[PDB]
Nucleic acid binder design. Structure first.
Lengths: 209, 56, 123, 114, 127, 71
RNA sequence: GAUGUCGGCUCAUCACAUCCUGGGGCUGAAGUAGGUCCCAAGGGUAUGGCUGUUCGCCAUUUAAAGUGGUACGCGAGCUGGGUUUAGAACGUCGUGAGACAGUUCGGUCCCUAUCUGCCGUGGGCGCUGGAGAACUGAGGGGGGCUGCUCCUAGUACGAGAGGACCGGAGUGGACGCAUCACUGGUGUUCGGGUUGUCAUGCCAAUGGCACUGCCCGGUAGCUAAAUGCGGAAGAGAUAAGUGCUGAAAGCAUCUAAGCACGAAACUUGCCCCGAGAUGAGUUCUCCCUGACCCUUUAAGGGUCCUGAAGGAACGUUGAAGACGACGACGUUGAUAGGCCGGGUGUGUAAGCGCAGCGAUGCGUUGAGCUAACCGGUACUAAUGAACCGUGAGGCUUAACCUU
RNA sequence: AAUUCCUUGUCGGGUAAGUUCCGACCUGCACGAAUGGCGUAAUGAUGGCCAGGCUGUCUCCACCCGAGACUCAGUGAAAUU
RNA sequence: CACAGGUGGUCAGGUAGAGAAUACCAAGGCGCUUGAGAGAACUCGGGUGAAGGAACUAGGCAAAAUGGUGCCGUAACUUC
RNA sequence: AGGACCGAACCGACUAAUGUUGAAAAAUUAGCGGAUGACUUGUGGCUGGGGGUGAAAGGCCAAUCAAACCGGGAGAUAGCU
RNA sequence: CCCGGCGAGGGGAGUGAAAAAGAACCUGAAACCGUGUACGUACAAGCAGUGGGAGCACGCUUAGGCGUGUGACUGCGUACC
C-alpha cells in the first residue's frame, strides 16, 4: 500500500481524560489527486504519480503543468510517486485521505530530510570539544586524529568528518498514530517529523515486518 | 604546510580559471531615456521608473 | 548524579547534611541520571543514632531534584535543591522511618513503601 | 497552511481570571496515581504571568512549610476541579525571589488598596 | 541554518547599531533623501516607519510617548508638526527603498531611501 | 570460493559464497572470472566494454542476427 | 643533510586466538548449574581517587569488566609532570672539578596543506532531436548490542528442595537518527527593574554611555540536560552438530554416490547514497514540422529569414544553505518592509484625578509598548527587454510502414 | 625524608579514594651534629595535603555577538623548491 | 615603520565616591585608516547559562569567586 | 618613625589567558608584589673580552653573552667532507 | 593632433640612413608572464620518455607513397649528481 504526502503544520502537547498529556506532532492529511497511473502497458514500469496540494504557481514550467492538467487540475506544489501492487489504480478522483490511518497502529514517516545548514565538525556526530583550559595551542575545540600511520597509509572509508547534511530522506521508523481526526483532517503522531515547519513529508503505513 | 617541488604552469592556470570573472549576459539600455542603464538597478540620474537616486 | 560524584541532601533520619552519589544504577557506560533513576550513594556524614555510619555504601532513590521532576503532563514540581532518600544496600525500601519537607505526586510506587504508608496524607 | 498561531488562540480557555503578579490563588486537583482517585488542594502565591496557549497553567509557589517549591498545575487539564482568584497584590515583576525561603506569613499576601 | 527569521545585524555591537541608527534617522528627517548600503537601508526604513505611525494624528500624550522611546528633539519635532499631517493620509509605506546600484569607492551594493510623498526633484547631477 | 574484497569498512574481510552470486544477480560469477584475465589499466578496460551478460536468459539481441559460436 | 619520548585526553582503525548473547557435542552431567567444548569479526564493550606511572591498590557499576597491532597509533591535534636536559638542592660518592636511567621545584612543543587520502560540494560533457518532471537498481554503506520480569514453564527430570530454550510482551541501559510542543538553555532585531554622571533652559517625566553598563523576565528559531524511536518476523547458503540411507568391513558409520534438519556471522529481509551501468537508462509531461550556395562529408563552412518548450544572468528574497547548488518569484506580483486582524512577551506608559510632607501607591485604563510567526492589504519597491536555446533530429541488421 | 634498593616502608586515620597528606614505629637505603643538627613567632607572587565557597575546565554542550576565515573590491608575502 | 615596546621634570578642573581607586566629564587630545555584506567549520576576543561544583588535568587555568565604609564579634600559636 | 602593611600614578614581572611566518628584541590584557625604600631615578663621569663588572646565575658588557666588534698572522690546520 | 587624474602611457603628423636608432634610445638569448595560430584532451590512469599509429592543417606531396608540426589509441618502460 501507498503513502500519504502530508504537511508539517502543527505541534501540540494534548490532554487525555486521566490528566496525562502526549507530546504530538500534527500533520494535515490532504486528499490525493491521481495524475495518470503509469503502468506496465509500456515496458515493465509500474508506479502512481500523485499531487496532494496546490501553489500560486505563476512561474511554473509547461512540463510540470501538463502533469497537473491530466490530474485534479490545481496548479500543483509538486510531483510525488509511489510504487504499487495488487492491480492498477483508478486514475481520477480516488481521494485517499484519513481513511488510510484508521487501522494503521504505527507509521514509518519518510521525510524530505532535515535542513540544518552546515552541521559539520563535532556538532553532527556529537563529539567532545578539546579542553578549553591548560593553554592548548590554537585549540578550545578539536575532533581528534582521523587515521593512524604509514602501516596502512590511508584513511578508511565512512569515517565521520565535516560536510553538510545534503537533504537526503530520513526514516524515524515505527512511531504510533495517536489519533486520526476526520473533518479537521489532522493525523496526530506520537513522535517527531523531519525538517523545519512548512516543509513537506511522506507519512506512510509502516514498511517493516 | 610546505611543498615537495616547484609546480607546473598548467596547475596555476587551472586553479584560477573557475574563479575568473563571469558574464553579465549582455546589458540593458532604458525604455524611458537616451541614458544607458544598469540592469534591474537605477541609473545615476534616477531613470528606471523615475523618482531619484544618487543625488551626489 | 549528573557528573561523577555529586553531593545532594539527606532527606530522612539515616544520616546528616549531605550524601554523595558514587554511581548510577540501572545501566552502564552512563555519565548523567534521568528523573526516575536509582543511584548508588556513599554516606559522607552520618549521625550516631541514624541507621548508618561514615563510608557506608548503600542504594538510594531521588526525592527532590532542583531542576524538577515530571511524568503525567511533563509538568515539574521544581525544588530548591536536590535530595535523596537512602534505601537498603541490597534489599530495598528506605532504612529511615520519616520524610522531611514536601513530596511529589510521582512518588506512588512499590519502591517507597516505607514513607508513603504513613498516615498524615498521600497513601 | 493558515492554522499556525491561530491554534494557540483556539485552544486557549476563556474563563481564565485577569491577573497581575503577587496574586495568591488556590488549585484543587487530583493526585492522579496509577489506578486510584484521591484529591488534594494547593495554595501559595503565583510568582509569574501565564497564558501559554494549550499548556497554559497556574504556576503557584507554595511556601507554606519546609524547603521551597514551585508547582505548575495545568489550566487545560480535565481533572482540575476548581480555581479561585482570592487576594490581589502588586509586585511589578516576572519574579518574586526574596520570599523563596521565607514561609512565615508568606501565603497570605495582602490586598493592595489605595 | 537560520530558518523562520527576518532582519539583519550588519557590522558591529548593539551600542554601535543604536548610535549609527541615531545618526542616520536624524539625517533622514532633515534631508528627506539618503543613499546607504542595501541591508542598512532596510533596517533604517524599519526604525522610522512605526514612529511615523504613532505621529499620524496630532496628539500631546503620543508626543510624550514618542519622547520616551526616542528621546531626541529633532525626531520628535519633525514628527507631529511637519510630518504628522503629511502622512495623515497614508496607512503604511511611509517610506520606500530604491535598489540604486553598486558603490564606486569599492563595489558595495546600495539602496536609497525616499519618503513616500517626496515628489518634486531635479534630474540633473551636482559636483 | 568466497570472492574476497575490502571496499573500506568494518573489521574483517567481507565475502559472498559462489552460490549467492549465481542464484541472485547471476552475471557476477562469470564477470569477475574474466576480469583478472585482461592486462593492468588502460588496455584491460578497453578489452572489457565489448562484453555483455545481462542477468541471464533475458537477452534483447534478436535483430542483429547473432553469429552462433560453440565453446 | 634524522621516523621526536613516557603516562593521559581527543579521534580512531584493523587480526580473532571472542569479554558477552546466540547454535551444539562430551561429562565420573539425573534436571538445573558448572567443568569440558566447537562455530563465529556482526554489535555493544563503564567510572572517581592517589602517583610523572606503564604496572599497583581501593571504592563502585555492568549480564560482563577482553586478547593483539598501529614511528612504545595519533605534538605538519593537545600537555611540560618525568629523566638525561642546562639552574637549585636532597641522598651518594670523589683532594676536587663533577656524575647518577635514585630524586624534588617550576620552566620556550614550531609550519596559512602543493600533490595524496577522506567526507561534503560546484562547474563541464556522453545520455542519441531537445527540454522539464518523476524514477528503476549494476553498485557500496547504516543497523546487527544487551539487563529486567511476565508468559513460555514448577513441566520432562529428581528421593526431595529445585528445574530450560525459542516466540510474544511490557520496560531499562548503551548506541544512532530525527524533532522543538513539553521541560530547561539562549535569543546584541521585545518589555521591565536598577547604580551613576552627563543631557532636553528648569521641574515632573525620559534618555546617550559605562561588558548588550548591571540584573530578571522574553516571541519565533535553534538546542539537550528534554522528546520520539530503530535494533525485525521471515527467507536462502550453511557452520559446528544429530542424522537417515550407504562403501571400505554382507552390517554399522555427517560421505563417497544420495537426502531431512541445523546460529545474531555470511546472502539478505528493515534503513540510506546510486545511470560514468560508455552495457551510456527507463517511464512520464511538453515543445520546435522556412530557405539557398559549397566542400572537407553518419560532417562542417557561409548567408538570409529566424529560435518554441526551456535556460541563466539579473532582482526583491526564502519555511534552502560556506560558496554554491536548491527554492518562492519580478505587477501575470503576498517575494519582503510597513500597515490592518491575531498569536505568543510584559505587567498597567506618560499625562490627569486622589491620599500622603514625600518616596510611592491607587482610579482614569486592565494601560502602554512588542522581534523573527500566521492570514490579509499593491501602501511600497522589484523599468521593460536583450541574450543562450531554432525550423523534426545517425549508421547498419531484424520488424512494421503501398515496403 | 627535597633522602628509602625493596616499598607505592609499616600501622592508625580522613575517603568512592589515599604512591600523595597527617601521627606514631623501625623490619634503619647510603640520615646524623657549622656542605651542621632539633624546634619556632612573623614572612614568601615559594612547595605538598585538607573541608566549605564560587565558577562552562569538565560531566555534556546549546544559543548570541565581533575581527579574520567565508562574500565583493584593493593591494599581495612565506616556509619551500 | 605614523611599531600598542621603552622613556625624566612641572602644572593641577567637575559630579557622585573614602583620595590622584573608581562610572561619567569641563578644557583639550583624538578615531592607532582597509571597508561594506554574510553570520559555515574554526581561530582570537566578548556575553549567558539548567543540575552539579574541578567530578577536567600531572596541576583550579586568569575567565568565576573574594573585596568597599560603618558596626557587632573574634581562635591555636606568639618573640604578647 | 619604620629595609612593616592594602594600594593607584611610578617600577617590576611569580602565575593565568593570548601573541607563537608578533602591534612588542615577552610585549599585551587580567590575577600579583614593591611603591618613605637595601626604592624610584634625570643629568654629568669611569673600567675594555677568558678583560672588566656581579647582595652569585659561570649573571652582564650597544637589541645578545659558558667568551663582544674589527684590522693582521692566514690560503691557520683538517690522519676530513 | 587624440584620450587624461592640472597626471602616466601610447598612437596620429613631421625628423633621420636607420626610431623594426624616440630619448630607461647600442644588437640581443635564456628564465619569466601574456597574446596569436594549428592539432589534441569527457573507456578517463604512475620519471612524462621510447616503440607502433588513425586523424588534421599547412608544403601545388615534384600525387608517385614524401616534408613539417601535432596526435585519439596502445606494447615497453623506476631521474641525474
Amino acid at each position: 500500500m501507498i503513502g500519504l504526502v502530508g504537511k508539517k503544520v502543527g505541534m501540540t502537547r494534548i490532554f487525555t481524560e486521566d490528566g496525562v498529556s502526549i507530546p504530538v506532532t500534527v500533520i494535515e492529511v490532504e486528499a490525493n489527486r491521481v495524475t495518470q497511473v503509469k503502468d506496465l502497458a509500456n515496458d515493465g514500469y509500474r508506479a502512481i504519480q500523485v499531487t496532494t496540494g496546490a501553489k500560486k504557481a505563476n512561474r511554473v514550467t509547461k512540463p510540470e503543468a501538463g502533469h497537473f492538467a491530466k490530474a485534479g487540475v490545481e496548479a500543483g506544489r509538486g510531483l510525488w510517486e509511489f510504487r504499487l501492487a495488487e492491480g492498477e489504480e483508478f486514475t481520477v478522483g480516488q481521494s485517499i485521505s484519513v481513511e488510510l490511518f484508521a487501522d494503521v497502529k504505527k507509521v514509518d514517516v519518510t521525510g524530505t530530510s532535515k535542513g540544518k545548514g552546515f552541521a559539520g565538525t563535532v556538532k553532527r556526530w556529537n563529539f567532545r570539544t578539546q579542553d578549553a583550559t591548560h593553554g592548548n595551542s590554537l585549540s578550545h575545540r578539536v575532533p581528534g586524529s582521523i587515521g593512524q600511520n604509514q602501516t596502512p597509509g590511508k584513511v578508511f572509508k565512512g569515517k565521520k568528518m565535516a560536510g553538510q547534511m545534503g537533504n537526503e530522506r530520513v526514516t524515524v521508523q515505527s512511531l504510533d498514530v495517536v489519533r486520526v481526526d476526520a473533518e479537521r483532517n489532522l493525523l496526530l503522531v506520537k513522535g517527531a517529523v523531519p525538517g523545519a515547519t512548512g516543509s513537506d513529508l511522506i507519512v506512510k503505513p509502516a514498511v517493516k515486518a | 604546510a610546505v611543498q615537495q617541488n616547484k609546480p607546473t604552469r598548467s596547475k596555476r592556470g587551472m586553479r584560477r580559471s573557475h574563479d575568473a570573472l563571469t558574464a553579465v549576459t549582455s546589458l540593458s539600455v532604458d525604455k524611458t531615456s537616451g541614458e544607458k542603464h544598469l540592469r534591474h538597478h537605477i541609473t545615476a540620474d534616477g531613470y528606471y521608473r523615475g523618482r531619484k537616486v544618487i543625488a551626489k | 548524579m549528573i557528573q561523577e560524584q555529586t553531593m545532594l541532601n539527606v532527606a530522612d533520619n539515616s544520616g546528616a547534611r549531605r550524601v554523595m552519589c558514587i554511581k548510577v544504577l540501572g545501566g552502564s557506560h552512563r555519565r548523567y541520571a534521568g528523573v526516575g533513576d536509582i543511584i548508588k550513594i556513599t554516606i559522607k556524614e552520618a549521625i550516631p543514632r541514624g541507621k548508618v555510619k561514615k563510608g557506608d555504601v548503600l542504594k538510594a532513590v531521588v526525592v527532590r531534584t532542583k531542576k524538577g521532576v515530571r511524568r503525567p503532563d511533563g509538568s515539574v514540581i521544581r525544588f530548591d535543591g536536590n535530595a535523596c532518600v537512602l534505601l537498603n544496600n541490597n534489599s530495598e525500601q528506605p532504612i529511615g522511618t520519616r520524610i522531611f519537607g514536601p513530596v511529589t505526586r510521582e512518588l506512588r510506587s512499590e519502591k517507597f513503601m516505607k514513607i508513603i504508608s504513613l498516615a498524615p496524607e498521600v497513601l | 497552511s493558515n492554522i499556525i498561531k491561530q491554534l494557540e488562540q483556539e485552544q486557549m480557555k476563556q474563563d481564565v481570571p485577569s491577573f497581575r503578579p503577587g496574586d495568591t490563588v488556590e488549585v484543587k486537583v487530583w493526585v492522579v496515581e496509577g489506578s486510584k482517585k484521591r484529591l488534594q488542594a494547593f495554595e501559595g502565591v503565583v510568582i509569574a504571568i501565564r497564558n501559554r496557549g494549550l499548556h497554559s497553567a497556574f504556576t503557584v509557589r507554595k511556601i507554606s512549610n519546609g524547603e521551597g517549591v514551585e508547582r505548575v498545575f495545568q489550566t487545560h487539564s480535565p481533572v482540575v476541579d476548581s480555581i479561585s482568584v482570592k487576594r490581589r497584590g502588586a509586585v511589578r515583576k516576572a519574579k518574586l525571589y526574596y520570599l523563596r525561603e521565607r514561609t512565615g506569613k508568606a501565603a497570605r499576601i495582602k490586598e493592595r488598596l489605595n | 541554518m537560520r530558518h523562520r527569521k527576518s532582519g539583519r545585524q550588519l557590522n558591529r555591537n548593539s551600542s554601535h547599531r543604536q548610535a549609527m541608527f541615531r545618526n542616520m534617522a536624524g539625517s533622514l528627517v532633515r534631508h528627506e533623501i539618503i543613499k546607504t548600503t542595501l541591508p542598512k537601508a532596510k533596517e533604517l526604513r524599519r526604525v522610522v516607519e512605526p514612529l511615523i505611525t504613532l505621529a499620524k494624528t496630532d496628539s500631546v500624550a503620543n508626543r510624550r510617548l514618542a519622547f520616551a522611546r526616542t528621546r531626541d528633539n529633532e525626531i520628535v519635532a519633525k514628527l507631529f508638526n511637519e510630518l504628522g499631517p503629511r502622512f495623515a493620509s497614508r496607512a503604511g509605506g511611509y517610506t520606500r527603498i530604491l535598489k540604486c546600484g553598486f558603490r564606486a569607492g569599492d563595489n558595495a551594493p546600495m539602496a536609497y531611501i525616499e519618503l513616500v510623498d517626496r515628489s518634486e526633484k531635479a534630474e540633473a547631477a551636482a559636483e | 570460493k568466497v570472492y574476497y574484497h575490502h571496499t573500506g569498512h568494518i573489521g574483517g574481510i567481507k565475502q559472498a559464497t559462489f552460490e549467492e552470486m549465481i542464484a541472485r544477480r547471476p552475471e557476477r560469477v562469470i564477470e569477475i572470472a574474466v576480469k583478472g584475465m585482461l592486462p593492468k589499466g588502460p588496455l584491460g578496460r578497453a578489452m572489457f566494454r565489448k562484453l555483455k551478460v545481462y542477468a541471464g536468459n533475458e537477452h534483447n539481441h534478436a535483430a542483429q542476427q547473432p553469429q552462433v559460436l560453440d565453446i
